[PDB]
Amino acid sequence: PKMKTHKGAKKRVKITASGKVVAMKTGKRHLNWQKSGKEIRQKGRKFVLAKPEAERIKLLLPY
Amino acid sequence: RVKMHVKKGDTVLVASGKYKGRVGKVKEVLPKKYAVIVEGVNIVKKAVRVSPKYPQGGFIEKEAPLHASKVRPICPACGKPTRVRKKFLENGKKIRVCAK
Amino acid sequence: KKGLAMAVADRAREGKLLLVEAFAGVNGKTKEFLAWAKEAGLDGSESVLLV
RNA sequence: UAGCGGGCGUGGAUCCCUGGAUGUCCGAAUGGGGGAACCCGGCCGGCGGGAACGCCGGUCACCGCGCUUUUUGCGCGGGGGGAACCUGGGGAACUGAAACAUCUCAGUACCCAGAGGAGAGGAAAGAGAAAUCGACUCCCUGAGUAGCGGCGAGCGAAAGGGGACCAGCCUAAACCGUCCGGCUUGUCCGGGCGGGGUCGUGGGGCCCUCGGCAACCGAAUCCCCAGCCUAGCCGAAGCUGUUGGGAAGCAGCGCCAGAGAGGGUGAAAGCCCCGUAGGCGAAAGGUGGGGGGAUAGGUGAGGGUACCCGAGUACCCCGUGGUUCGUGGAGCCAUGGGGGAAUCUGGGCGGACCACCGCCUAAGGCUAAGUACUCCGGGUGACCGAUAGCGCACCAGUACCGUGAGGGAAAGGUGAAAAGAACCCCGGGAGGGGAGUGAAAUAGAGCCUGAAACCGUGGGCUUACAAGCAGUCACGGCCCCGCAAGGGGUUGUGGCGUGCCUAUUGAAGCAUGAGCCGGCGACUCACGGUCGUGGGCGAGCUUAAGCCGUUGAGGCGGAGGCGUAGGGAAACCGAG
Ligand SMILES: [Mg+2]
Ligand SMILES: [Mg+2]
Ligand SMILES: [Mg+2]
Ligand SMILES: [Mg+2]
Ligand SMILES: [Mg+2]
Ligand SMILES: [Mg+2]
Ligand SMILES: [Mg+2]
Ligand SMILES: [Mg+2]
Ligand SMILES: [Mg+2]
Ligand SMILES: [Mg+2]
Ligand SMILES: [Mg+2]
Ligand SMILES: [Mg+2]
Ligand SMILES: [Mg+2]
Ligand SMILES: [Mg+2]
Ligand SMILES: [Mg+2]
Ligand SMILES: [Mg+2]
Ligand SMILES: [Mg+2]
Ligand SMILES: [Mg+2]
Ligand SMILES: [Mg+2]
Ligand SMILES: [Mg+2]
Ligand SMILES: [Mg+2]
Ligand SMILES: [Mg+2]
Ligand SMILES: [Mg+2]
Ligand SMILES: [Mg+2]
Ligand SMILES: [Mg+2]
Ligand SMILES: [Mg+2]
Ligand SMILES: [Mg+2]
Ligand SMILES: [Mg+2]
Ligand SMILES: [Mg+2]
Ligand SMILES: [Mg+2]
Ligand SMILES: [Mg+2]
Ligand SMILES: [Mg+2]
Ligand SMILES: [Mg+2]
Ligand SMILES: [Mg+2]
Ligand SMILES: [Mg+2]
Ligand SMILES: [Mg+2]
Ligand SMILES: [Mg+2]
Ligand SMILES: [Mg+2]
Ligand SMILES: [Mg+2]
Ligand SMILES: [Mg+2]
Ligand SMILES: [Mg+2]
Ligand SMILES: [Mg+2]
Ligand SMILES: [Mg+2]
Ligand SMILES: [Mg+2]
Ligand SMILES: [Mg+2]
Ligand SMILES: [Mg+2]
Ligand SMILES: [Mg+2]
Ligand SMILES: [Mg+2]
Ligand SMILES: [Mg+2]
Ligand SMILES: [Mg+2]
Ligand SMILES: [Mg+2]
Ligand SMILES: [Mg+2]
Ligand SMILES: [Mg+2]
Ligand SMILES: [Mg+2]
Ligand SMILES: [Mg+2]
Ligand SMILES: [Mg+2]
Ligand SMILES: [Mg+2]
Ligand SMILES: [Mg+2]
Ligand SMILES: [Mg+2]
Ligand SMILES: [Mg+2]
Ligand SMILES: [Mg+2]
Ligand SMILES: [Mg+2]
Ligand SMILES: [Mg+2]
Ligand SMILES: [Mg+2]
Ligand SMILES: [Mg+2]
Ligand SMILES: [Mg+2]
Ligand SMILES: [Mg+2]
Ligand SMILES: [Mg+2]
Ligand SMILES: [Mg+2]
Ligand SMILES: [Mg+2]
Ligand SMILES: [Mg+2]
Ligand SMILES: [Mg+2]
Ligand SMILES: [Mg+2]
Ligand SMILES: [Mg+2]
Ligand SMILES: [Mg+2]
Ligand SMILES: [Mg+2]
Ligand SMILES: [Mg+2]
Ligand SMILES: [Mg+2]
Ligand SMILES: [Mg+2]
Ligand SMILES: [Mg+2]
Ligand SMILES: [Mg+2]
Ligand SMILES: [Mg+2]
Ligand SMILES: [Mg+2]
Ligand SMILES: [Mg+2]
Ligand SMILES: [Mg+2]
Ligand SMILES: [Mg+2]
Ligand SMILES: [Mg+2]
Ligand SMILES: [Mg+2]
Ligand SMILES: [Mg+2]
Ligand SMILES: [Mg+2]
Ligand SMILES: [Mg+2]
Ligand SMILES: [Mg+2]
Ligand SMILES: [Mg+2]
Ligand SMILES: [Mg+2]
Ligand SMILES: [Mg+2]
Ligand SMILES: [Mg+2]
Ligand SMILES: [Mg+2]
Ligand SMILES: [Mg+2]
Ligand SMILES: [Mg+2]
Ligand SMILES: [Mg+2]
Ligand SMILES: [Mg+2]
Ligand SMILES: [Mg+2]
Ligand SMILES: [Mg+2]
Ligand SMILES: [Mg+2]
Ligand SMILES: [Mg+2]
Ligand SMILES: [Mg+2]
Ligand SMILES: [Mg+2]
Ligand SMILES: [Mg+2]
Ligand SMILES: [Mg+2]
Ligand SMILES: [Mg+2]
Ligand SMILES: [Mg+2]
Ligand SMILES: [Mg+2]
Ligand SMILES: [Mg+2]
Ligand SMILES: [Mg+2]
Ligand SMILES: [Mg+2]
Ligand SMILES: [Mg+2]
Ligand SMILES: [Mg+2]
Ligand SMILES: [Mg+2]
Ligand SMILES: [Mg+2]
Ligand SMILES: [Mg+2]
Ligand SMILES: [Mg+2]
Ligand SMILES: [Mg+2]
Ligand SMILES: [Mg+2]
Ligand SMILES: [Mg+2]
Ligand SMILES: [Mg+2]
Ligand SMILES: [Mg+2]
Ligand SMILES: [Mg+2]
Ligand SMILES: [Mg+2]
Ligand SMILES: [Mg+2]
Ligand SMILES: [Mg+2]
Ligand SMILES: [Mg+2]
Ligand SMILES: [Mg+2]
Ligand SMILES: [Mg+2]
Ligand SMILES: [Mg+2]
Ligand SMILES: [Mg+2]
Ligand SMILES: [Mg+2]
Ligand SMILES: [Mg+2]
Ligand SMILES: [Mg+2]
Ligand SMILES: [Mg+2]
Ligand SMILES: [Mg+2]
Ligand SMILES: [Mg+2]
Ligand SMILES: [Mg+2]
Ligand SMILES: [Mg+2]
Ligand SMILES: [Mg+2]
Ligand SMILES: [Mg+2]
Ligand SMILES: [Mg+2]
Ligand SMILES: [Mg+2]
Ligand SMILES: [Mg+2]
Ligand SMILES: [Mg+2]
Ligand SMILES: [Mg+2]
Ligand SMILES: [Mg+2]
Ligand SMILES: [Mg+2]
Ligand SMILES: [Mg+2]
Ligand SMILES: [Mg+2]
Ligand SMILES: [Mg+2]
């Protein structure tokens, strides 16, 4: 009883005001070596999901 | 306790079933079963004798008890409910307006 | 609230509501209130919520 | 609980309440033994002729505490049990992580010791950011927040705010007197007793100066009482006719109601009975601060000096436990090992450490209420109604099963009333047939109702040249219903035709399950989500625990929650 927020999610995702869900781009802490400077500049911008946005949101709700 | 009820060995009207209207003295009060025998509800017990002793016992059609509810006490009138009332000491039941 | 008001209202728009004060049938005794009832037109023909 | 056979009661029995008496033997079991309910004794006294024997009454277990001269004694107490609740000492695994070891399940299950109508906790060496709060416990909220986490599974606080309850106390030490023991006579060494003392505006001790107190407070201890509990009592109002086996139904007139809750009476009763509303009651036991009374206790201001303020403790380190905290920057609380102080210029704490600013006074104990539970009594159910409801409506923790721990059933109903069927008849009996009772006997005694499977008797249609998932369609014959057109039962020939469920690409299938009937039998609820939908209100909407009502009446209660601003990891900025 009383759903608990998924801490794992909250620690890496945000609900936007319109109900979207965003997170940092993957693949930018390792594979790094000299990947085009362009790549890593674009691995900085965060993005929105799609369907797991809904899977994701459910894991919150008090949030 | 509590087993007490309407009245005792005395005069009474049967407002019951088949013996409605009939009236007479109650010869026995059974407090446990809550019954009384008067002179009504006579019933023939075809049976021989009632005990392992003596020969002929007769079809003694003697009275069968009645639910104490169907009999009502009575005094200078006709079927008056009971009402207890105490004097300067003890206690005696005056009928609906009279006494005893 | 609304319900309470609306109920009292419904029974007013209906005409059945009646305010009083002239309770001469005081003194807790059914027969008295029974007498006051007739005078007030509560012939006991209809159920009543006496508040 | 009837019967045989005898008794008692208005000189007030039975029965109910309180207290008392008697209470074999076993059981903590306690003189000793023992295979519980048996066996055997010591001492004092009694009974029989009573020395031998036996019976009767009393007494004799063990441990702890205190007096008792070590000795023997004397007194007070402990031992065992209890459904659940409680505390402490120990403490799993399946399981979850879709494997598994950290982790989870969980300090759960269980074992053990103890406490009591409760138990625990409890008057800050606290909280933690307000220069704020002010014992403890309980509820709501804060909050699924802060955090914790093979940052996986998952786990998950506190401050604060709203409520219930409300309460505060006693000592150790410095100091003085006394008693006993000790030496090397000292306001001295130890022990016991009394006085003194008890807190963080730090307090107390000892000295100087003021009352040299009437007073003011006052119990959690006693005493009286009210009230209440353990039996009870009073209690309004109805008759007639009618149908019937039986009124309480139907009808006619009438009444009570602080009582029209419910139950019973041959059916369906406010006024017949038991009650209900409303009132009354204790000699005796239990309870009893709610009221009253008493006692125990309890308290003022400055100055001086530095006597005291709980030790193998604080403190540090090694090993761990607790907390939201899993070694993490890891404090705090607790402590198994090693080292080891100070008495306010003293110590602990505010999350490593240092400084600053503040909080609190460890190393002794006690404390009501609000809280938990339900063996027991009572009240009430949009709770069951005999395969249900407790395992048990009934002679059940029984029968029966098992060496044992343990397992554990089935089984309720005649009728209003036994009026339980005299008597006759067939029969060894059982059981029937009459007679009889009853409204009813196909209510006849494991007897209301009496379904289905299953067995049988009688009647109608049908069958011995016939090939079948048993039926359906058509026509014909026979039998039966209605004046009739018609309908019912049956089946001769003809046409047609691969059971039901399950599982499968596919089943009549030689794939699954079912002997048949009856009854039991499987998508629920709680909390939190997310949509949809019916309404209330709207930049607002809504209360939680609780309090006041009520006894199937609701109101109060804004603490708190969602919404009115987003973006950023954040500092921060803001329709950006
Ligand atoms: Mg990364
Ligand atoms: Mg290249
Ligand atoms: Mg009367
Ligand atoms: Mg007897
Ligand atoms: Mg006699
Ligand atoms: Mg007695
Ligand atoms: Mg006894
Ligand atoms: Mg004994
Ligand atoms: Mg013994
Ligand atoms: Mg023994
Ligand atoms: Mg002799
Ligand atoms: Mg002898
Ligand atoms: Mg002795
Ligand atoms: Mg012993
Ligand atoms: Mg011992
Ligand atoms: Mg000992
Ligand atoms: Mg001695
Ligand atoms: Mg003594
Ligand atoms: Mg004593
Ligand atoms: Mg005990
Ligand atoms: Mg253990
Ligand atoms: Mg495991
Ligand atoms: Mg395992
Ligand atoms: Mg697993
Ligand atoms: Mg699961
Ligand atoms: Mg698995
Ligand atoms: Mg395995
Ligand atoms: Mg691991
Ligand atoms: Mg745990
Ligand atoms: Mg714990
Ligand atoms: Mg434990
Ligand atoms: Mg205890
Ligand atoms: Mg209590
Ligand atoms: Mg307590
Ligand atoms: Mg304590
Ligand atoms: Mg204080
Ligand atoms: Mg802090
Ligand atoms: Mg202040
Ligand atoms: Mg605070
Ligand atoms: Mg406060
Ligand atoms: Mg809460
Ligand atoms: Mg990690
Ligand atoms: Mg845990
Ligand atoms: Mg609080
Ligand atoms: Mg406030
Ligand atoms: Mg509070
Ligand atoms: Mg001491
Ligand atoms: Mg001293
Ligand atoms: Mg002295
Ligand atoms: Mg001394
Ligand atoms: Mg002495
Ligand atoms: Mg001496
Ligand atoms: Mg001395
Ligand atoms: Mg002393
Ligand atoms: Mg004192
Ligand atoms: Mg003192
Ligand atoms: Mg002081
Ligand atoms: Mg001086
Ligand atoms: Mg003076
Ligand atoms: Mg003075
Ligand atoms: Mg004086
Ligand atoms: Mg009083
Ligand atoms: Mg009282
Ligand atoms: Mg009583
Ligand atoms: Mg009466
Ligand atoms: Mg009456
Ligand atoms: Mg007639
Ligand atoms: Mg009739
Ligand atoms: Mg008649
Ligand atoms: Mg009648
Ligand atoms: Mg008249
Ligand atoms: Mg009255
Ligand atoms: Mg009726
Ligand atoms: Mg009635
Ligand atoms: Mg009384
Ligand atoms: Mg008395
Ligand atoms: Mg008394
Ligand atoms: Mg008692
Ligand atoms: Mg008492
Ligand atoms: Mg009290
Ligand atoms: Mg005195
Ligand atoms: Mg004073
Ligand atoms: Mg001074
Ligand atoms: Mg000075
Ligand atoms: Mg001086
Ligand atoms: Mg000075
Ligand atoms: Mg000074
Ligand atoms: Mg000390
Ligand atoms: Mg120690
Ligand atoms: Mg780890
Ligand atoms: Mg842990
Ligand atoms: Mg800390
Ligand atoms: Mg240690
Ligand atoms: Mg000092
Ligand atoms: Mg110095
Ligand atoms: Mg510390
Ligand atoms: Mg601290
Ligand atoms: Mg510290
Ligand atoms: Mg602190
Ligand atoms: Mg700090
Ligand atoms: Mg501070
Ligand atoms: Mg503090
Ligand atoms: Mg203290
Ligand atoms: Mg001490
Ligand atoms: Mg203390
Ligand atoms: Mg000590
Ligand atoms: Mg206590
Ligand atoms: Mg409960
Ligand atoms: Mg229960
Ligand atoms: Mg009970
Ligand atoms: Mg009960
Ligand atoms: Mg039912
Ligand atoms: Mg049955
Ligand atoms: Mg049945
Ligand atoms: Mg059973
Ligand atoms: Mg039984
Ligand atoms: Mg069996
Ligand atoms: Mg069974
Ligand atoms: Mg019988
Ligand atoms: Mg016969
Ligand atoms: Mg023979
Ligand atoms: Mg016979
Ligand atoms: Mg016959
Ligand atoms: Mg007849
Ligand atoms: Mg009939
Ligand atoms: Mg007949
Ligand atoms: Mg029949
Ligand atoms: Mg019948
Ligand atoms: Mg039979
Ligand atoms: Mg039968
Ligand atoms: Mg019946
Ligand atoms: Mg049949
Ligand atoms: Mg046949
Ligand atoms: Mg033929
Ligand atoms: Mg054939
Ligand atoms: Mg063929
Ligand atoms: Mg025929
Ligand atoms: Mg016809
Ligand atoms: Mg055919
Ligand atoms: Mg064919
Ligand atoms: Mg085919
Ligand atoms: Mg099926
Ligand atoms: Mg076959
Ligand atoms: Mg097969
Ligand atoms: Mg298979
Ligand atoms: Mg098959
Ligand atoms: Mg199957
Ligand atoms: Mg079979
Ligand atoms: Mg469902
Ligand atoms: Mg929903
Ligand atoms: Mg709406
Ligand atoms: Mg609201
Ligand atoms: Mg307000
Ligand atoms: Mg306020
Ligand atoms: Mg952001």
Instruction: Choose among A28, A4, A14, A26: nearest CA to A57.
Output: A14
Q: Are B98 and B78 in contact (CB under 8 A)?
A: no
Give break positions in chain B: residue before each, C–N beyond 2.5 Å.
none
Instruction: Choose among B52, B93, B69: nearest CA to B5.
Output: B69
Q: Which nucleotides in chain D lie less than 7 Å from some protein C-beta? A: 3-5, 10, 12, 15-16, 143-145, 147-149, 151-156, 231-240, 245-248, 256-259, 264-266, 269, 271-275, 416-423, 435-438, 526-530, 536-537, 555, 565-569, 575
- Residue identified by tokens 């009543």 is C48
Neighbours of B73 (CB within 10 A): 20
| B23 strand D contact, CB < 7 Å | no
| B87 strand D contact, CB < 7 Å | no
Nucleotide with the nearest C1' to B59 CA = D422
| A35 strand D contact, CB < 7 Å | no
* Full DSSP string of B81-92: -EEEE--SSS-E
Instruction: Choose among B61, B19, B26, B56: nearest CA to B40.
Output: B19
- Residue B22 and residue B8: Cα distance in Å, rounded? 17
Strand partners, B30: B35
Instruction: Choose among A44, A54, A51, A1: nearest CA to A23.
Output: A44
Q: How far is CA B37 from CA A46, B25, C36, in A?
A: 103, 9, 50
Q: Are B53 and B37 in contact (CB under 8 A)?
A: no
What approach was used to elucidate this structure?
A: X-ray
Quick one: tokens of B57?
Answer: 């016992």
Q: How far is CA B46 from CA B37, B38, B59, B62, B91, in A?
A: 20, 21, 5, 11, 46
| A63 strand D contact, CB < 7 Å | yes
Q: Are B22 and B14 in contact (CB under 8 A)?
A: yes
Strand partners, B9: none
Q: Are A40 and A33 in contact (CB under 8 A)?
A: no
- Residue A41 and residue B63: Cα distance in Å, rounded? 116
H or E stretch covering B66: strand B66-67
- Residue B74 and residue B24: Cα distance in Å, rounded? 10
Q: How far is CA C49 from CA C21, C29, C44, in A?
A: 15, 18, 12
C2 CA to D82 C1' in angstroms comes to: 56
Q: Are B22 and B2 in contact (CB under 8 A)?
A: no
Strand partners, A47: A23
